[PDB]
Amino acid sequence: GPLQVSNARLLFPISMPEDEGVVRLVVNNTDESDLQVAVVSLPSFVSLDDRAFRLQAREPRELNLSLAVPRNMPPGMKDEPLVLEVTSPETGKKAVDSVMVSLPLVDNFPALTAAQTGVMELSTYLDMGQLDGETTKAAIEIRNVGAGPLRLHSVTTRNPALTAVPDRTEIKPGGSTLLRIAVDPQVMKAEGWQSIAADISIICNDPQAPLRRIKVKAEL
Ligand code: NA
């Protein structure tokens, strides 16, 4: 529709529950006349007072989403939409669109002791080579070398050809679990990709690196 947005995605920095922080979206009224804009839904972890405004023309206004983590929200990657409802007083009415807002929410580590935290060891680079038309599986061993249980709060992929699921989400000291990875070359083809280079993102209770990324490569 008429409204144009600075970003399809907004991403808070890695944050602890008490962190403050702000993400900025610039919306712009493209077509001709008045746009009436309502922010009809906000992520549960953000604040916005600029919620119901009028817009004249061009690329005029700014929205500043303040971080407000709900008390007792657990750590992990949060992905929630900012929902924008646009009504053109004259030329019709409605278009609805959303911007995905992401938060890498981690543990409050200064409040945790060594007996409560893990240390993650794994391969962070996986080149799967040439796949030639079949869904291809791999497994990365995730190891806990810490003194406490290693907890995998979230394991997320953004690429639609890539999935990753750990066998367990809590790993005792000296123990390990498999991260089962699958790449779908048919999805890559349907998307006109000859190759991918995509991250698996892991949020965990490793105090030295609570957000860990595995780069996965694959070609058709
Ligand atoms: Na995916």
Neighbours of 190 (CB within 10 A): 11
Spacing, Cα 105 to ligand 1 middle (Å): 20
Question: Which residue carries 């929902």 as its tokens?
Answer: 83
Spacing, Cα 34 to ligand 1 middle (Å): 38
Where does 86-143 have alpha helices with state H? none
Spacing, Cα 145 to ligand 1 middle (Å): 28
CA 1 from chain centre, in angstroms, equals 25
SS3 readout for the chain: CCEEECCCEEECCCECCCCCCEEEEEEEECCCCCEEEEEEECCCCEECCCCEEEECCCCCEEEEEEECCCCCCCCEEEEEEEEEEEECCCCCCEEEEEEEEEEEECCCHHHCCHHHCCCEECCCEEEEEECCCCCEEEEEEEEECCCCCEEEEEEEECCCCEEEEECCCEECCCCEEEEEEEECHHHHHHCCCCEEEEEEEEEECCCCCCEEEEEEEEEC
Q: What domains appear along the chain, each with residue ranges and CATH number?
A: 1-112 (2.60.40.10), 113-220 (2.60.40.10)
Where does 61-195 have alpha helices with state H? 185-190
Spacing, Cα 193 to ligand 1 middle (Å): 15
Q: Which experimental approach was used here?
A: X-ray
Helix (H, G, I), strand (E, B) or coil at 188: helix
Structure tokens at 145: 């070398």
Spacing, Cα 30 to ligand 1 middle (Å): 33
Q: To what resolution in angstroms was this structure determined?
A: 2.1
Question: Which residue carries 């806990």 as its tokens?
Answer: 144
